[PDB]
Structures are given as C-alpha cells and as structure tokens.
Amino acid sequence: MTLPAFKAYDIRGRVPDELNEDLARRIGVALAAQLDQGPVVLGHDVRLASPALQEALSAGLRASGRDVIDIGLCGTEEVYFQTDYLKAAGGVMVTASHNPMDYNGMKLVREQARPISSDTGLFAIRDTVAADTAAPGEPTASEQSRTDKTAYLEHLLSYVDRSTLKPLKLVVNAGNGGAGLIVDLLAPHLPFEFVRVFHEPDGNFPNGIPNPLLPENRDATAKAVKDNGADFGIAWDGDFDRCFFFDHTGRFIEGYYLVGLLAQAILAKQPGGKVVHDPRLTWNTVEQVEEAGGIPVLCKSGHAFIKEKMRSENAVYGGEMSAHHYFREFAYADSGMIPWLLIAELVSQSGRSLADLVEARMQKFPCSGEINFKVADAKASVARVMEHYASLSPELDYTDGISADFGQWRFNLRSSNTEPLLRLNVETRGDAALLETRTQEISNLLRG
Ligand SMILES: O=P(O)(O)OC[C@H]1O[C@H](O)[C@H](O)[C@@H](O)[C@@H]1O
Ligand SMILES: [Mg+2]
Fold first, then answer.
1. Contact predicate 95/45, CB 8 Å
2. If we measure between CA atoms, which residue out of 170, 175, 249 comes closest to residue 218?
3. How far separated are the first and last CA of the chain, in Å rounded?
4. What would the CATH number be for the domain defined by 169-246?
5. Fold of the domain built from segment(s) 1-147
6. Is 9 in the pocket of ligand 1 (CB under 6 A)?
7. The ligand 1 atom nearest the CA atom of 280
8. How far is CA 3 from CA 26, 64, 417, in A?
9. Which atom of ligand 1 is nearest to the CA of 302?
C-alpha cells in the first residue's frame, strides 16, 4: 500500500505508527532532492513530539547537504513568512494543527513559501520515502538557530495605522496552542487591553485540543467576552493559521462574513485590487468586493489553488469561509494574526461594533453554515440531489464540486480534500425561511 500519513495537502498521522523520527528523517532527505538551491526553514508547534520530529527532519536535511534555519516554536505562518523573507529554498512546519495530542504532522513549502501538495511534490516525497532503505548519512551542513521574530512582528504591524487604533478590550484565546506568544510580543506596540484565555502553550491540552469550532471550546471565548464587556474575542487553532471571531455579545461570527469584511478593509488601502474567494459561499463576498471598488475572483477551495490564483492575478487578498485569510504582502500566505489586527483597526476607525459591521450582511445573505455528510454512496447522493432540482434549471458551475444557482438561493456541494466527507453550503437572498427549507430538503436527499 502507501503511507497513510501523506494527505492531499500535508503530512498528518498518529505518532509513532503513522509518523515517527525515522520517517521524519527520510522526509528531510527526500525534501532536499525536491527543492531548488538554498537553506531550509524549520519550525514546530506546541505538541510534545514536535521538537523530536523537527530534529529528525533537520538531521535528514543536513545529511543531504542542506543548511537548516531553525526558527523554533512558532506558528505555521511564521514558517511561511521566514521561508520567503530569508529567501530559503523551502520550509517545513511540524504541526498537527487541531488533531488530538497523539497526532502530529508536517506542512511543506518550497521557494516563496509555495505549497508542496500531493500533485506538486508531496507524493513524490512519499514514494521516495517509501522505497528508501539507505543507511542514514551524517550531516554535511550546519543548523543555525534564528528565533528572532522582529521582522515578522514588524510585518504584522505594518497592516494597521497604529495612530488610529483605539484601546479596545479584546479577548484572546490561544487554546493552549502557540498564538499567545505572538499576542504578547505584539501587545507593547498596541493600545488594546487583552483578556487572555487558555493562554499558556501546553501540548497536553488540558482545556481541550485547539479547535475553536468545538462548541465547548467556542463557549470559553464567548463567556470571556460577555463577562468582561470585551469589544470582541479572537480564538485560534493550535498553529494559529486559522482565526475565529466573537462579537461583543459573545456570538461566534460565521467565517463567510469575515471574507467580505476583510476585503473591504483591505481595498480601502489598496484601491481596485483583485480579491480571491472560494465557491462555497459567494454572493456576499462578490457584492462587498465590488462595492469597495475591487474585483472578485472565483477560485477552487484549498490554499494551494487560492495562492496560485492570487499570484496569477496579483490579488491583494484572498479568503475562504473555512477561516483562512491570505495576503499578497505576506508572501501570498495565510495568517491568523493579520485578520484580527485589520478587524481591530476597522472597529477603531469606524466607531462601529464588530456585530454591527456584519449584521446587515448576515441578514442580506443568510447561510446554512457548512454541513458535513458521511454517506454510503457520495456519488449517488449528489446525483439524487441534482436530479431532484433539475426541473428548476439552476445555473450550474463545476469550479469545486457542484454549485447551483437558482436565483434567490444557491448551494455548493463538494467532496472534502482533507476528510472522506461531502460538504454542503446553502445561502439565500435575504430569506431565512427559504434557507431552512432548502437546506433541510437537500439534507434529506443526501441521507436517502
Ligand atoms: O473543505 P476541505 O476540502 O476539507 O478543506 C478545508 C481546508 O483544509 C485545509 O485547512 C486547507 O489549508 C484549507 O485551504 C481548506 O479550505
Ligand atoms: Mg491550523
């Protein structure tokens, strides 16, 4: 067979049977043969096994003659940023993002932090690793420790006009992942008062694995916002490339609406720019981008597609409803830090609450939220849905699964590229009743 840890976008598996130090070392060797000339940036998250997996990666890379730049404990976006900033040949982040504490993994990038995915080198690396029975060589290159975050922090701060910021009270919830370390390094440069929840890095995850989508984890941020009268709250996943917002009432804001909000915030600074968006939920983003003078660009979901579309279009910003936000000036990479800095600036400058910034958009384009289905026959289930609606003659688009536009409502229905699931998103033109009846109708057809 094949090694199960090699997924479409990254490496992730259980330690030590799906991923271990030996595999990690062999991955470093294979990665060296895939990259153009230069050093390789390595970083890791708070998980207990991550240092040892990074060390093994470094040993394989240096046995293959690659200099290693160890940036230490960090977020995934710091590996992206330093890989580009230091003009490295590539980078690896050791992380399992949101998986249990017995899982780990790797996200791999080449020059300018361009993704290495299944069809762009990752399965090539897998096959190499699978057949590699060579003895480990010894290092022929050095490792340098470069933990300085100054350039990264200054880059984050460059997205906001410091003099326009107000001393907002912000709940921050690192979920015992790594985000709190960056918050604390930014704080001396910001006027905000921070309310720190689950702040200390702890790979034992005593308060739950870092997944702000779990309602029990969500409620910790919501409660801290309400109990402290905070202007809003921010939570992150463990490697903090995903950020999650809570308004002053404690309400979790559906990530869809952050894409349009951030696009308007960016286009205020970068007039007329292109904005890349996914096909899952679209109408609000298209309208807000256009009303801010930008040009919306439909793109297949998935960071590798989004980033390459942004590059080919010189797009200033891209966003997915799945809490990923990409910035051209950030090496076209996603950041879980830039979004809340931009939102805090927008709240400061506009005098409006986060709630009111999104309220009218949520009323105008209500959405189902993403609903996942594990069914016995995904292909037959999709066919049942499409057959049922055929007589209404929807406008159909196959950018990413099936998108069907009926006029006053639309849906996207696609297979996930990270799990064996179907994912449904529905939205309507200001009609909550139609949203619920169509969502339930599609759901029944899928389960039939
Ligand atoms: O909906 P999926 O195919 O499962 O992908 C969900 C997400 O997986 C990863 O997080 C990718 O980096 C994202 O770009 C993608 O949106
Ligand atoms: Mg993550």
1. yes
2. 175
3. 33
4. 3.40.120.10
5. Alpha-D-Glucose-1,6-Bisphosphate; Chain A, domain 3 (3.40.120)
6. yes
7. 1
8. 13, 22, 17
9. 14
